[PDB]
Design a protein around this nucleic acid. Structure first.
Lengths: 324, 177
RNA sequence: GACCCUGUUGAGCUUGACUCUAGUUUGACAUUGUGAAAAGACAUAGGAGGUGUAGAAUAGGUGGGAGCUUCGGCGCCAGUGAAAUACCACUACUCCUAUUGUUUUUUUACUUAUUCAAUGUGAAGACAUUGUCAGGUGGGGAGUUGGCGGCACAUCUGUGCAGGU
RNA sequence: AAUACAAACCAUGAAAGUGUGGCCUCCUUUAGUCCCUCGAAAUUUGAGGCUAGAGGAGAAAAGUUACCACAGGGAUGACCGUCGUGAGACAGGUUA
């Protein structure tokens, strides 16, 4: 029965009862069992090289000579490799100390390829705590333009300044604002990128506290929190520019209370926002209506990432275009 | 929000030109007219463009943390510091360059000083206390420091002696994580 | 020796007032046109919509209602689903076609706006450029820094209850 | 010592006895009005306003650290140097 499967999952795996009810309603039990096996399995660690410093086959040759087992990540990423084993530690190697590459997950890869930063462009990243997201747009734009990065906490603000200046971006302004306070103070940005904080249900191998420390107050405040973030995101973006800017929304949650519901509110409230295809090869179709709520049927182009079909973390990406 | 004052820009340009040869090239009227105007915040200086400063002067002082790329900070005594954050600016138009080998760059990146066995090849006409920039065999900018002696005295000294004094490296990047 | 104290040097953390404002500055407005090329969004008349899951089924949704039946097909019952189906009433939007049209935006061309040369008519040209507010910063500049008694009297404001001398 | 109570004393009255020494005390941290506004949410919350427990000479530079280096004081190979202070070196040192 449904209740018997819920009790067996909670006892054997340790999930919260309300979180297990959400995941069982989200997916069929055959897909849910693969999901519970995938997120308990540790995720692979991938390497993103610096295009401003070297190229992929140069770093691959260097790490092979140093003793690092490598494999390129499919055909959709010319900048990434996957780590199997490494005799030398990755943090103490000369390449990482010089800044030839950076360490990230597959969730950090995707929303920057979703964006298309060009040369001499103005870009915003209201949440770039690991700092690899801000570096990759600089890698794509070849260090041409102005970049703004926002961060809420000092501890991760001092963390990323060690990362960016190691990688050598040289044109990004990082700070400690509120993302809701960003468009009123400065505004007027061509491109905006938002990695909205959420429950973190997509990645539980990195964050095991999501399995238990998520009460009913959390799934009400964080969707309301990112609702004001996307309202700030659409206010920062410019409607018209010489180079077409876009709004990219990303989060590490798998539940529908964080995915395809906030972007439906922003689409319904502001008619100037239109969503286009993000140009992404692999992904999952958006749901037209899930829990008694009719969303806009254009969300089929909105992509999702699940841990069992691909060796990626739980992720969700959306793309928007401003008209007026 | 304020710019560099008279003495404060004097000491900044004193320590910069001790490691810089073309200060005219770094701050000059560009094609668009934008200039690389200096900037300081919380007793920590920065190197930004003017158009960067306009889109950053709209912000309250306490909310802003950094701006552009950093050059260094000032102590309580008033002396100037140049950091490893200023290395891409420093290595771009370097006056004196010293190249160290891979078996010598690893102690250099750990925090050890430069030994005569560490260096592969050399520049010429380097004085005793002149500043210099430290590179590897592959022209990767590693760090900077003041040499212990001149070029000719480095030839006639023991290979186990300290050659160039290590000031900063990429360990500050590893420290801040 | 450990240990404690003093002076200098670094690592720091915090402060370095209040109100305006230069330096500034974000966004929008008008100056700022005329044609051509297009694109988007709003006026319409129409064709068709609808799956995360399960349910035989691709479930708009809402109100009734258990055969109007052309048929016992499906209604009914029953699983399965937040929502169950026959029927007849409603409107939300969507993918589009065309025009029965309104706007908006980009590019090009020309001078009619703008600005320069001559200076008592010419040119670049709708790019710039100027003015207007709604916000932000401002350390530089200007200004500043333990108790309550008692209505116990006379005159004025208030204009028995009050206040001022 | 304060305080409570008792006794003594004191004031009045001829006696009888009676009699006495109030009620209070700009922002930052915290809780409530779940009151009002702005939102979200198929009906419950989020942010402000309001209320109440407590704190507070100015750009020249300051305060403080079971902290680092150097020098000095106290208590139970090693120096005078010269050359640099962001770190250090010496065919220079009183004999043959």
């Amino acid at each position: 029965y449904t209740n018997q499967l819920l009790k067996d999952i909670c006892a054997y795996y340790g999930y919260n009862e309300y979180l297990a009810e959400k995941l069982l309603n989200l997916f069929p039990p055959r897909e849910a069992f693969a999901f519970f096996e995938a997120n308990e399995t540790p995720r692979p660690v991938v390497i993103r090289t610096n295009t401003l410093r070297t190229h992929r086959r140069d770093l691959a040759q260097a790490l092979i000579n140093r003793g690092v087992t490598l494999e390129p990540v499919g055909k959709w990423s010319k900048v990434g490799l996957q780590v199997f084993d490494s005799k030398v530690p990755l943090g103490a190697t000369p390449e990482y100390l010089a800044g030839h590459y950076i360490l990230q997950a597959a969730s950090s890869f995707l929303p920057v390829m979703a964006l298309c930063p060009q040369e001499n462009e103005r870009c915003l990243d209201m949440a770039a705590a690991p700092g690899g997201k801000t570096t990759h747009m600089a890698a794509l734009m070849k260090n041409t333009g102005v970049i703004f990065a926002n961060d809420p906490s000092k501890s991760r603000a001092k963390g990323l300044i060690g990362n960016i200046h190691r990688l050598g971006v040289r044109n990004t302004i990082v700070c400690n604002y509120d993302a809701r306070e960003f468009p009123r103070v400065i505004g007027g940005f061509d491109r905006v990128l938002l990695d909205a904080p959420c429950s973190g249900t997509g990645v539980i191998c990195k964050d095991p506290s999501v399995k238990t420390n998520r009460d009913a107050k959390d799934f009400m405040q964080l969707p309301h929190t990112q609702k004001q973030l996307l309202l700030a995101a659409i206010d920062s973006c410019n409607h018209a520019s010489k180079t077409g800017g876009y709004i990219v929304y990303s989060t590490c949650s798998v539940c529908v209370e964080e995915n395809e519901e906030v972007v439906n509110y922003a689409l319904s409230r502001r008619p100037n926002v239109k969503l286009v295809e993000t140009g992404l090869p692999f992904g999952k179709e958006g749901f037209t209506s899930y829990m008694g709520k009719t969303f806009h049927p254009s969300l089929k182009l909105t992509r999702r990432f699940y841990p069992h079909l691909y060796n990626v973390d739980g992720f969700f990406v959306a793309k928007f275009k401003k008209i007026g | 929000m304020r710019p560099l004052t008279d003495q404060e820009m004097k000491i900044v340009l004193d320590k910069l030109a001790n490691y810089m040869t073309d200060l005219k090239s770094l701050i000059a009227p560009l094609e668009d007219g934008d200039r690389y105007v200096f900037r300081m915040q919380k007793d920590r200086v920065y190197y930004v463009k003017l158009s960067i400063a306009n889109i950053a002067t709209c912000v309250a002082r306490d909310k802003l943390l950094s701006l552009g790329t950093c050059l260094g900070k000032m102590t309580k005594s008033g002396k100037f510091r140049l950091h490893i954050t200023a290395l891409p600016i420093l290595a771009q138009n370097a006056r004196y360059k010293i190249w160290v080998k891979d078996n010598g760059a690893q102690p250099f990146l750990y925090g050890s000083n430069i030994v005569k066995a560490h260096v592969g090849r050399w520049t010429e006409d380097c004085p005793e206390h002149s500043g210099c920039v430290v590179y590897n065999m592959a022209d990767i900018p590693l760090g900077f420091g003041v040499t212990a002696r001149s070029t000719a005295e480095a030839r006639r000294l023991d290979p186990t002696g300290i050659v160039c004094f290590r000031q900063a490296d990429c360990g500050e990047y590893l420290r801040d994580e």
